[PDB]
Amino acid sequence: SNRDFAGREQRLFNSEQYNYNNSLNGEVSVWVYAYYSDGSVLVINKNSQYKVGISETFKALKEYRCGQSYDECEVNQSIYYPNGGDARKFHSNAKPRAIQIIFSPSVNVRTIKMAKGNAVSVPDEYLQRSHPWEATGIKYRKIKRDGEIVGYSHYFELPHEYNSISLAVSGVHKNPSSYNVGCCHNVMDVFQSCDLALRFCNRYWAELELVNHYISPNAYPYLDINNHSYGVALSNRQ
């Protein structure tokens, strides 16, 4: 009947979560996954109100294995300028082989912007001719579970020796209202949100460990190398 209040409250509890995240009071989140040839995965996450992003150097995206280097500094020198380095190797296995960018479903996809630079942090060959970003939202796939969008994914390989990148990405929380969250009334709150943004960074040994111990316990969206979707659908669901 309609007197199953445990049922109604369960459905409302999940719907409230879905809707709260999508309100101007909620989070918008981005993740950058860098995939290494040893099968480990670096994740960088940022979670903030209003807008959020991540910006990393070429060096910062390379694999680092905690408590386990001169040569890798020389690799960097030889990637910033051809034959600029004294490295003992042709291809550094610390270079990411691929990147996946994921946004929370509370992003507005039309606001997504990416600055994929070269190894010296120039977006498009020389600064003089560079637009500082590309709007790549059209490339984002919907990660879906049970018919619900649980996130958005952009996946690109770096399979060539010349794929040596710096990377920044940014998205704005959805706002279907005509209230500008950056209007004079609220602009200091957006400034404060820049300070309040929380960052997370970790290297998982395997995609399995990433799925088991990072994605799933936190109810985050993910798309794996086999094109399998992860996440939790909450809108009007028990």
Next chain:
Amino acid sequence: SNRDFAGREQRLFNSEQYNYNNSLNGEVSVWVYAYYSDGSVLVINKNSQYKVGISETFKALKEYRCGQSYDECEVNQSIYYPNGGDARKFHSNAKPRAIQIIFSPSVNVRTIKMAKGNAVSVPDEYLQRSHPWEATGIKYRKIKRDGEIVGYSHYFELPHEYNSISLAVSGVHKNPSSYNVGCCHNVMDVFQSCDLALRFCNRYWAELELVNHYISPNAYPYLDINNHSYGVALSNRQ
């Protein structure tokens, strides 16, 4: 004749580059060069739309040689407070001897601001009496090539034992229009530009290597210790 289209297109291609960088769609860039007594040079670069800056601690400006420390931590302690440390040396050679700040020609020089703090990151002796910046644009020299301004330079020595600094610098992209890039219509784009800014950091062994492998390959402006200008002039030039 005027039917040399290869000529006309070459001149237009360079002029378009010059003008694009100076548009509100283009980059503004800053560089901080820290010069060490061993002749090596630390460069920090940031490239962003609308506005850009760099902010570093006292410790972060000191020389670090990758894959090549307890004592240098004690140096820091003895610089934060007189006789505060247990260091085995009078003068740390990891301290910068000089700084050069360079901006791209797309900066508005009247917007440049510098916060040169003491070693505990206070701009002017005590926080209570500190204005958080100085507007130093009047000190910037034009770096010129072939009559064209290719950048702006501020150079200062730190030749005394008491020159122990923290440092931040900021400039705004030129905007001769009456369109405020921070107006309500566009303010979220400036917020996004904070996330999209790309950073680069590297230590070059010698100024020669800096000129050869960092400045010149990227068409950046530079002024060397001999007062020689580097850069590329593009406005109405082949």
Next chain:
Amino acid sequence: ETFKALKEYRCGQSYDECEVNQSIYYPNGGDARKFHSNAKPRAIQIIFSPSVNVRTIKM
């Protein structure tokens, strides 16, 4: 050559790589700290001199 002998070794430049071997000889047989060893060859090329009889080649 053995499996182990074909793996990358960089002279004058290992416990973990022994455990990699154990985990490749039998699934979950090892205590290695990595999913894929980069010391594994990605490809092989066999070349013979033109003085071979190709119909005698065996692998």
Next chain:
Amino acid sequence: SNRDFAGREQRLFNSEQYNYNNSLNGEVSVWVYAYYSDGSVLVINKNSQYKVGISETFKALKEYRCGQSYDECEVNQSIYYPNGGDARKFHSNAKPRAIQIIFSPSVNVRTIKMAKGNAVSVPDEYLQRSHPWEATGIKYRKIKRDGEIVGYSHYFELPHEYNSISLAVSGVHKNPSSYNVGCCHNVMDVFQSCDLALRFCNRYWAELELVNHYISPNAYPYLDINNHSYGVALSNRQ
């Protein structure tokens, strides 16, 4: 009934395996197990057509623990000649305490030959009086499972301080035909088999790990320290 074709095919699939291995087209295999006092076990395996063997030095049979030596070199010197070394120990625990030789059931036991030398690789005291092998087949026990011979075993202890050995062993694939596999028609194929022979070498921490992760997953024969037989019976069996 006789219309259980899944049954008939299962029995044929196993019988074909048994018979193929025993054909002149099949493998003959030998294993040398060296048992150390820390309970670890070195295995050397060789698998080849027609004939197969293993030959190891005194030094090569000693325990080596990967990524975990001057003294052990001196041990060798003091074992090659009495008081020839400057070692800091009476008995090296790296010396094997026992050896087990196992052959596949496709060997002809009457062809087995062993050269158990002294520590300087002399079969019988001085080269001048040495026959280069002993035919030891009469000592091999049948390893049996369910009434089927799954292999052949020779086990000997080295419990005395003077048991310091080099070791080689060899057997020929059974061939009940009158076709000599080394006849002129096929002798180059036996030469090629010397190159095609595949070798395996590994140290297992315990006999348990050897049984679980080496013997059993590969369907190899084994006889453990408790006289227990392992292997798989295939002739006319489901």
